[PDB]
Amino acid sequence: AHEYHNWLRSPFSRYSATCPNVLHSVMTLAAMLYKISPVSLVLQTKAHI
Amino acid sequence: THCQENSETVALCTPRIVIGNLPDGLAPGPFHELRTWEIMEHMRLRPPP
Numbered sequence: 001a002h003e004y005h006n007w008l009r010s011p012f013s014r015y016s017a018t019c020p021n022v023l024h025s026v027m028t029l030a031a032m033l034y035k036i037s038p039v040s041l042v043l044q045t046k047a048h049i
Numbered sequence: 050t051h052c053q054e055n056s057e058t059v060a061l062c063t064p065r066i067v068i069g070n071l072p073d074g075l076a077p078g079p080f081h082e083l084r085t086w087e088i089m090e091h092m093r094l095r096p097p098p
Contacts, residue, residue, distance in 0.1 A: 018093040 019025050052061045
């Protein structure tokens with residue numbers, strides 16, 4: 001139960017319950033994985049994401 | 050509601066335990082279906098499976 005030291009917290013389980021079962025949701029889980037960091041931010045925004 | 054008891058008239062009161070109990074003059078039938086649609090929209094099942 002170490003949710004604060006865990007890598008993947010409760011917002012993922014809450015989103016999973018209301019999931020529509022189409023492949024678009026899978027990429028939505030994949031998209032949420034984007035990192036919060038300086039290098040990740042600059043690379044992400046340089047693509048205009 | 051008024052009611053008869055052993056040849057005398059008395060008053061009677063009960064709780065509206067379910068929202069459906071409301072007479073449709075104060076809550077029409079189509080309103081309940083569209084409220085269910087709002088339920089579905091909150092639950093992301095906007096088109097039913």
